[PDB]
Amino acid sequence: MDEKVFTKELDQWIEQLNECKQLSESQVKSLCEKAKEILTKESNVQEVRCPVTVCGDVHGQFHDLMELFRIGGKSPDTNYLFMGDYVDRGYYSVETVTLLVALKVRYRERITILRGNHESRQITQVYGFYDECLRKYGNANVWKYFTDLFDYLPLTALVDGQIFCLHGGLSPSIDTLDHIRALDRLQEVPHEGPMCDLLWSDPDDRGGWGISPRGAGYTFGQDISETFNHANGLTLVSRAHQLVMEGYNWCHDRNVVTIFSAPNYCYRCGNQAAIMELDDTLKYSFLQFDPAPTPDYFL
Amino acid sequence: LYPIAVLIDELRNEDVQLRLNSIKKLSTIALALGVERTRSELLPFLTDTIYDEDEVLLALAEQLGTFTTLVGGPEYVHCLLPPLESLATVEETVVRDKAVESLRAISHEHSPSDLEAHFVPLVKRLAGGDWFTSRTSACGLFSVCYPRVSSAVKAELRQYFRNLCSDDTPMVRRAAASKLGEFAKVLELDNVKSEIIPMFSNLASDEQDSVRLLAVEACVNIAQLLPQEDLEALVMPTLRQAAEDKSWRVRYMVADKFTELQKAVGPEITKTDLVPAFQNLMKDCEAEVRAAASHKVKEFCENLSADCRENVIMSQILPCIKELVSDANQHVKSALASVIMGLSPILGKDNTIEHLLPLFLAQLKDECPEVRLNIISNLDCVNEVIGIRQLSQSLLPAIVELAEDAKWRVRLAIIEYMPLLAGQLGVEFFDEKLNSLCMAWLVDHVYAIREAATSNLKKLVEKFGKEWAHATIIPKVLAMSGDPNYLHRMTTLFCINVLSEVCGQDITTKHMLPTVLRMAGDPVANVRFNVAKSLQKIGPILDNSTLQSEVKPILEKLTQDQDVDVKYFAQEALTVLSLA
Amino acid sequence: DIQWCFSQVKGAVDDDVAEADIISTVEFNHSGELLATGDKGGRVVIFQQEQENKIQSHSRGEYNVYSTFQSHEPEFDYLKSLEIEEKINKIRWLPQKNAAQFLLSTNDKTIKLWKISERDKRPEGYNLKEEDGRYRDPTTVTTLRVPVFRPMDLMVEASPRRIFANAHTYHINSISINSDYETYLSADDLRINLWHLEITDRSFNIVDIKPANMEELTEVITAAEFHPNSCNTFVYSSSKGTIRLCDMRASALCDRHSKLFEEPEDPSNRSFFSEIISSISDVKFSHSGRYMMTRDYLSVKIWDLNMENRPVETYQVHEYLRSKLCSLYENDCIFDKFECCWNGSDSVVMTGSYNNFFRMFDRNTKRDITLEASRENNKPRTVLKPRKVCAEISVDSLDFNKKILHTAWHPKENIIAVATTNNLYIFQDKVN
């Protein structure tokens, strides 16, 4: 009874969002409440089964996300796995995050929205999510419910126990997956510790742990990733959060892979986007898509 | 009563959103207050109220335009003038534009006596103010009061406009150049020639190139008012100086408005002066000017003089097009490609085959995706004029080679063009060459391409019949059901869905139904609930016996699966089919 | 002779100040009646000249405080984990649109458009509540009354209108308003963006000098000014002495400067600091646009816009430090960025110097004067002697911390504002 009409409302909300039109404050409130109710049961490592389509940073670009859905298929037909950065310097961040959260609520067994570094109250205020939210709503309400919904988003994901999908990188204090399980993710990201490094880290070329160029988190070399993979018994560490020119990149001798799925990032780097598709044969098929179809004053 | 008082208090509030909501509901406040009270104590509160932000002032300016009935009709509308005069002076250009628009809207309710006594003095006050925002707002209030005042007031308004065009702040001149075409439409022709032409010539040679690029629109709007004989002596020299302008923005504006210029000046002046101007614009050293000029190529060549249309095209425009095809700029090629195909019917079949066809081939094999995309988008124009017996020898290899190119938008364009193309080639020849192409599209690594090829398969089936599908197309579709990549199994399901309604009842029952039923045991829940969706979609065409005998047990078995999605999509499949 | 007398000073009550009151820029209004001084900390103070009555002339007006607002609050960019400095870099007064007053104030990352309006009337009255905020029951009110604006004491308020941010990855050092009333430029170290005064989401980058490899940095933009008369011509300096005069009529992207003002270097005229002391600190166009000014660390050069290979006039400010440049390289005091200013009629040129000194070169009479900006040795009704240096006062007696890094000149009068480290000094010639 109630479930049927609620699912109809969710489907209508997704259909309206697909037309670039935002939702109402009450609708965002109900969506955030339902999404938190759903996500509170998801562990710090969300075990997700193949087949899956691992996507990376979207960063508010909504037409670019629609292009993504046009390359790999639509939900619930295609099983997706997003890892962070749906907001913050996208010109349509609210629509992107609302669509992803609605897809997670309506198709809880088909989507898996992870948590990124640009998903926290600190980051969302300076880099154009609070400002965009005020421009599109006039109050800090729906921004507030989006940011405290961001708390319950899972930190990691394990695809068939062999692909380790996280938004950032490995932690100096974390050696096994059980350490990530022991973490308490029902809070904003800290400025230090395991939880911050799981979303702020970066793979580098030099071996061993290193200082991050972003000042937050650490960097891990090839041997760190090799040790982590041989200790956890898994074949690949998928990640995002780093801009890659070709859309996807392989690091540490094909041990980790960066999947950045926001094309034309910064509008002047010209980078492509990539998504990573997995089947039960575990074949990594990387798709790419760059497009999404003087200034006026000087015209 | 109480909510209206809440609104009245809410005009003076610390919350921007609440104040904006109160101002947006000013009509109810005025209705409750009454015409006399609004004229006496509500409106004067709205004249000094300029302390707000952009949205609040913009909403107030919009509301004041529709206030003339709430203050007491068209007789007391002059009391609406102080708030709008105050709003036309603000710094925000959107608020200024809306205040000007509302002043113009309520200027049609002024009686001519009230006009010359209250609104014309307002225009003089705005155009003689010390703030250049007031004069910028006054530039747009001369075309609404001119045709309804006396001769003396007309002369004063013309003098004030002439002073506006000769101002010292670039913004006022730039705003007067925009409204010069509008002001010239309400003038007298003798007055036009005597006054606007010096004004237009002075604005067209302004020290600021941002005021020069509005003289192009002024020229377009002026050439439509003068006789064809007076254009050469009054307007044409300035247009020639504007096409050959030193600033690339003025040349870009001329290229952008070239079609309107050709329409306005009359075909003889086009053939005489504008054709060299068009050639010089298409050979411009500026990439954006070249792109703007190439955007108008087909329209300009179509609107040329019919006496020597194709002759002048081939003699003058064609070499410059052959040069633009080989250009070093992506936008110029992408803009010429989207418009070049329309030139084919004008030249005819023989001229097309001789000259345009090498250009079409060079643009189809261009390294830029946009050029190829536009050429394929407009291929129908030449396909209609050169027929099908001549198209294939020169064009078909390009389509076949480009249906497998990198950019999937080009592949999608070819997919959309494929049904219309193959319709003219018949089943016998399409099967030999293009059927493999249409089948290989179904396996493409982009879901958009798979869906496009699915729709194209529907179109091909509806064009060629069901027997061809049953013999050569359907077995190939079911061949993908054993694909190790489950995306392609979903693609087979999608193809069966889009083929069920068009391929036929008995054929759906006997050939593709068993695969849809069998795929319900796929170890990927996505294929299971897509089988549920496919069965729901296909149900209406099946007969009762096959439905209730085979589909019902299989669809019901999907309602015991562990996945929630399969359960839901089978549950809202039994009920829609009335099988529950 | 021209007598320059102390007129005004603004400073703290005590003699102990932090890095939040050091004056960072001074810029007069277009009409000169206003004067903004955005010290470090994002605190802009606007000084309005006392209104000169058309009846009294025995005394000219001083510059009293007129407005004060926090232009930039401290900010922290998380993606790089540094602190965005709140220091105000450049203040540019827009021409008067209406009774309000506008200015572009920029920190190292953002540019704001502030509106300095004046309120003299406030609404008085409420329908439900009382005239003081105490609520009342709606059961005693039946007639609707609208508020009435009653006069109140003059109050000045500043509110940001547009914020132009997230378009400069390097320190913004200069802005300049175009002579077309609808656009302006902002120049960081390695690129120049052209903004619209009402479009904050897009900036059309017109100059880019960023090399492919950042290890080969040979030139950074240190100033960029539009042309006072041309809608399109704009000049921008560099750290290697090059002075490029772009002309935006030619192409959309200004990858090719129309002119390049540069003095050819010769080995006989250089020993070790050819690459260092040749960096232009700020370039100012003449009010007529015919000439142009560029101030390096030790020489002032006035270029004619036609002659692209030789300065018309060269003035030496503190050439008596040339013997001590080596001592200035170890204490990190040679990298100062002095600013030059033009006369109202392009007849006299003035620029700052060390130890509360700022020199004044006369273009016509070729006579130079060095004045001092201090108050502990100047008294009311006391003439001031033009200070002199020995090249008397020794060269080692110069307080290298009491520098004058920011100067301004009245547009149509003889009032100059000289900002010291903490105190802002206003000089005004005395005419009896």
Curated annotation (Swiss-Prot), chain A:
State the superkingdom.
Answer: Eukaryota
Q: Which residues hold Zn(2+)? A: D57, H59, D85
Q: Which residues bind Mn(2+) 1?
A: D57, H59, D85
This one is known as: Serine/threonine-protein phosphatase 2A catalytic subunit alpha isoform
Write one Pfam family the protein is assigned to.
Metallophos
How does its record describe regulation of its activity? Inhibited by the interaction between PPP2R2A and ARPP19; this inhibition is enhanced when ARPP19 is phosphorylated. Inhibited by the interaction between PPP2R2A and PABIR1/FAM122A.
Species this protein is from? Homo sapiens
Report the InterPro entries cross-referenced here.
Answer: Calcineurin-like_PHP_ApaH, Metallo-depent_PP-like, PPA2-like, Ser/Thr-sp_prot-phosphatase
Report quaternary structure and partners: PP2A consists of a common heterodimeric core enzyme composed of PPP2CA, a 36 kDa catalytic subunit (subunit C), and PPP2R1A, a 65 kDa constant regulatory subunit (PR65 or subunit A), that associates with a variety of regulatory subunits. Proteins that associate with the core dimer include three families of regulatory subunits B (the R2/B/PR55/B55, R3/B''/PR72/PR130/PR59 and R5/B'/B56 families), the 48 kDa variable regulatory subunit, viral proteins, and cell signaling molecules. Interacts with the PP2A A subunit PPP2R1A. Interacts with the regulatory subunit PPP2R2A.
Disease (UniProt): Houge-Janssens syndrome 3: An autosomal dominant neurodevelopmental disorder characterized by global developmental delay with onset in infancy and additional variable features including hypotonia, epilepsy, brain abnormalities such as ventriculomegaly and a small corpus callosum, and autism spectrum disorder.
Post-translational modification Phosphotyrosine, affected residues: Y297
Q: How is the cofactor bound?
A: Binds 2 metal ions per subunit. Can be two manganese ions, or one iron ion and one zinc ion.
The protein's matches in PROSITE patterns, at most eight in alphabetical order, are given as:
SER_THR_PHOSPHATASE (PS00125)
Name the GO cellular-component terms: chromatin; chromosome, centromeric region; cytosol; extracellular exosome; FAR/SIN/STRIPAK complex; INTAC complex; membrane; membrane raft
Binding positions (Fe(3+)): D85, N117, H167, H241
Q: Which residues carry this modification: Leucine methyl ester?
A: L299
Residues that hold Mn(2+) 2 according to the record: D85, N117, H167, H241
UniProtKB/Swiss-Prot annotation, chain B:
Report whether Repeat shows up as a keyword of the record. yes
- One Pfam family assigned to this protein is PPP2R1A-like_HEAT
**Effect upon mutating R249H:** In HJS2; reduces PPP2CA binding; reduces PPP2R5A binding; reduces PPP2R5C binding; does not affect PPP2R5D binding; reduces PPP2R2A binding; reduces PPP2R2B binding; reduces PPP2R3A binding; does not affect phosphatase activity of PPP2CA
For the region Polyoma small and medium T antigens Binding, give the residue spans.
38-312
The keyword Acetylation appears for this protein: yes
How does it associate, per the subunit comment?
PP2A consists of a common heterodimeric core enzyme, composed of PPP2CA a 36 kDa catalytic subunit (subunit C) and PPP2R1A a 65 kDa constant regulatory subunit (PR65 or subunit A), that associates with a variety of regulatory subunits. Proteins that associate with the core dimer include three families of regulatory subunits B (the R2/B/PR55/B55, R3/B''/PR72/PR130/PR59 and R5/B'/B56 families), the 48 kDa variable regulatory subunit, viral proteins, and cell signaling molecules. Found in a complex with at least ARL2, PPP2CB, PPP2R1A, PPP2R2A, PPP2R5E and TBCD. (Microbial infection) Interacts with JC virus small t antigen; this interaction inhibits PPP2R1A activity.
InterPro entries, alphabetically?
A: ARM-like (IPR011989), ARM-type_fold (IPR016024), HEAT (IPR000357), HEAT_type_2 (IPR021133), PP2A/SF3B1-like_HEAT (IPR054573), PP2A_Regulatory_Subunit_A (IPR051023)
Q: PROSITE patterns in the record, alphabetically?
A: HEAT_REPEAT (PS50077)
Tell me which residues bear N6-acetyllysine: K271
Source organism per entry reads Homo sapiens
- Entry GO MF terms: protein antigen binding; protein heterodimerization activity; protein phosphatase regulator activity; protein serine/threonine phosphatase activity
User: Which UniProt keywords are given for this protein, alphabetically ordered?
Assistant: Acetylation, Cell membrane, Cell projection, Centromere, Chromosome, Chromosome partition, Cytoplasm, Disease variant, Host-virus interaction, Intellectual disability, Membrane, Nucleus, Repeat
Swiss-Prot/TrEMBL domain comment: Each HEAT repeat appears to consist of two alpha helices joined by a hydrophilic region, the intrarepeat loop. The repeat units may be arranged laterally to form a rod-like structure.
Q: Where is this region: PP2A subunit B binding?
A: 1-390
From Swiss-Prot, chain C:
Quaternary form? PP2A consists of a common heterodimeric core enzyme, composed of a 36 kDa catalytic subunit (subunit C) and a 65 kDa constant regulatory subunit (PR65 or subunit A), that associates with a variety of regulatory subunits. Proteins that associate with the core dimer include three families of regulatory subunits B (the R2/B/PR55/B55, R3/B''/PR72/PR130/PR59 and R5/B'/B56 families), the 48 kDa variable regulatory subunit, viral proteins, and cell signaling molecules. Interacts with the PP2A C catalytic subunit PPP2CA. Interacts with the PP2A A subunit PPP2R1A. Interacts with TP53.
Q: In residue terms, where are the WD repeats?
A: 3-72, 86-166, 167-210, 219-262, 280-317, 339-373, 399-431
Biological function: Substrate-recognition subunit of protein phosphatase 2A (PP2A) that plays a key role in cell cycle by controlling mitosis entry and exit. Involved in chromosome clustering during late mitosis by mediating dephosphorylation of MKI67. Essential for serine/threonine-protein phosphatase 2A-mediated dephosphorylation of WEE1, preventing its ubiquitin-mediated proteolysis, increasing WEE1 protein levels, and promoting the G2/M checkpoint.
Per UniProt, which keywords does this protein have? Acetylation, Repeat, WD repeat
* GO MF, one annotated term: protein phosphatase regulator activity
- Comment, domains: Has an extended WD 2 repeat that is important for the interaction with PPP2R1A.
| Distribution of this protein across tissues and organs | Expressed in all tissues examined.
The gene it comes from is: PPP2R2A
Q: What is this protein called?
A: Serine/threonine-protein phosphatase 2A 55 kDa regulatory subunit B alpha isoform
| SMART domains on file | WD40
InterPro entries of this UniProt entry? PP2A_PR55, PP2A_PR55_CS, WD40/YVTN_repeat-like_dom_sf, WD40_repeat_dom_sf, WD40_rpt
User: Which species is this UniProt entry from?
Assistant: Homo sapiens
GO CC terms: cytosol; glutamatergic synapse; nucleoplasm; protein phosphatase type 2A complex
Name the protein family.
Answer: Belongs to the phosphatase 2A regulatory subunit B family.
Mention one GO biological process in which this protein takes part, according to its record: regulation of chromosome segregation
